[PDB]
Structures are given as C-alpha cells and as structure tokens.
Nucleic acid binder design. Sequence first.
RNA 1: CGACACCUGAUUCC
DNA 2: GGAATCAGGTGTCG
Lengths: 154, 151
Amino acid sequence: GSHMGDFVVVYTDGCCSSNGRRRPRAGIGVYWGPGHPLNVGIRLPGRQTNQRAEIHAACKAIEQAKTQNINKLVLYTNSMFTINGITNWVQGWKKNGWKTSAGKEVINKEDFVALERLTQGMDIQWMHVPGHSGFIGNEEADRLAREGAKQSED
Amino acid sequence: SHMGDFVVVYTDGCCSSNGRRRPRAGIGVYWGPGHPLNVGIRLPGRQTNQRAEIHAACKAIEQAKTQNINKLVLYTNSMFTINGITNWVQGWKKNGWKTSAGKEVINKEDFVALERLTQGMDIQWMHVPGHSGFIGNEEADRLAREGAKQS
RNA sequence: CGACACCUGAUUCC
DNA sequence: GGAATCAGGTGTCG
Ligand SMILES: [Ca+2]
Ligand SMILES: [Ca+2]
Ligand SMILES: [Ca+2]
Ligand SMILES: [Cl-]
C-alpha cells in the first residue's frame, strides 16, 4: 500500500462520458493500491459532469480514509479545477457569497462545500498528476472511474 | 474522352509488437511488380504507427523526384497522413502548429518534412479502406513488415 | 485570453 | 480494446 512518510497515498479520478452532450454518464474512481480492498468505482449521483465527478472522486477518498482512521494523505488527481478550488478559490469565495470572478454564482458551490466539510481535521497534500502521461496510479484510478459510470449493457 | 498523365504508387507504414520487447516500425513503398524503386526499409526514429505511415509517403514522392515525375496518384490506407497533408497543415501553419486542443501537433516534424517534398510536386492522395481493393496495398503493406525486420 | 480536465467522431494496426 | 492522432465540443475558474 503506497505511503509517503505517514502520508498514505491515493489516486482519484472522475469521468463523465458524453460530457456536455445529451445523456451524461459519470462516475468516480479511487485507487489505493493493487487489488486493494478500498478501491472504489462508484457512479456519481445527481448532475452528470466531469467537474463534480472529479471533485467528488476526491470526496470519496477522504470519506473513505476517515473511516480507516487516517488523518493525513497525499491525494493525487489530474483536476486542477479541484486542487485550485479546494486550496485557493474556495477561501475567497466564502468571503463574498460564492461569486465567480465575473460576478455570478460559483457553479460548483454545493460540491466544494461538501469537499471542504471533509478537509476538516484532515491533512491532505493535494498533488497533481499529468493526463495520459503514463502514471499508473492515475490510470488505474481512471480505469476505476469508468467502471463506475458503466453502461449496464454488459 | 481526355488523355492520361500520372503514375500510380501504393504506400504503407506499420508499427509492431506494442509493449517494449519491441516497437519496430517499417516503411514500404510499391510501384509495381519487380519494379526497381519498390523498397521496404526500416523507419529511422521514434518507432510509431502514424509517423512511419507518413515518411513512408515521403520516400514515395522523394523517389518520385529521382524520376523527374511531376504528378502521381498515391495510395494509402491511413487518412491521418492524408487528412494531415490535405487539410490540417495549412491550419497548423496558421497557429504555430497547435492541436485543436491547445497542445502541439506531435507529427509536425513529420508533416513538415512531408509538405517539403510536396513542393512543386502534384500529389493526388487516395485513401483505401482496410482490406480495400487492389493487391497493390497488400504488397506495399508487405514490404513494410519486411522493412520493420531490418536493423 | 489562459489553464486542467471530461468527452464525441473518425482512420489504420494488431 | 488498446496504441497511434486529429477535429470538434463541453465543464469551469481565474
Ligand atoms: Ca481526470
Ligand atoms: Ca481520467
Ligand atoms: Ca496499410
Ligand atoms: Cl492498381
């Protein structure tokens, strides 16, 4: 199980097939290690978009971890939108009604709020991993996030 | 009706055993039975599918040059090379070669060199659906493999 | 404008 | 069931 000095490692990823198209199918994915018992591939409730799938993949992780009574983790992801939110954009947003830099409702509020609710007491070390750059951890989490939005066909 | 004016040529580029044990790509260009210019050498460089399939078009016309031929019909199954040369290049030339997604068009170095030889020359690209018609393809296609074997 | 993603479609190969 | 690669489009924020 990947660790990094008392910081248990974890990769997360979200996906949303047909994002911005008629019927969006979106799922969350979180990989803790090979054949690891915490590796989830859930489907994302409600709104179907990559952005929330992505930040919610991260929620699942934290949510999971707490249950495993782990307080500090190095959570990798390829979502800058999530990282930038959770560690910058949010703070501001709170002090001003969650209004975008163009003066309008911070769209993914509900999502970030949840996510921030969970950073509480946790010492997350948000790390970013490149796209299809070949990093296992991320590709296995990607793998998972799809099986989470599986078609149900077969 | 009308006369006749060009020469035909089939071209194929292949990339092997995906994994690591390998990734051998070969070029292969056919001009007809036993014809001298028929050749199927190995692809020099970053061994890949697309890339080979392109340079495999360079050699073609490049030899077309070494024959003072001014216009041919080039056959190929990859409409990446085709689309690339018949369209996406002018665009790439008017955008510092940026993928219609912000990043850099990887085979610029290739599509560049290719557009070079296209100079003065008049190529009429012909795409052929896999398992197309005309043995011509199965033949170039065959040298490719033979090429990929050389060191 | 920029940035990180999420896709849809194509063509070939095996 | 990918790897090659591209076009076109959304998700969202500075
Ligand atoms: Ca992602
Ligand atoms: Ca992904
Ligand atoms: Ca071929
Ligand atoms: Cl013929």
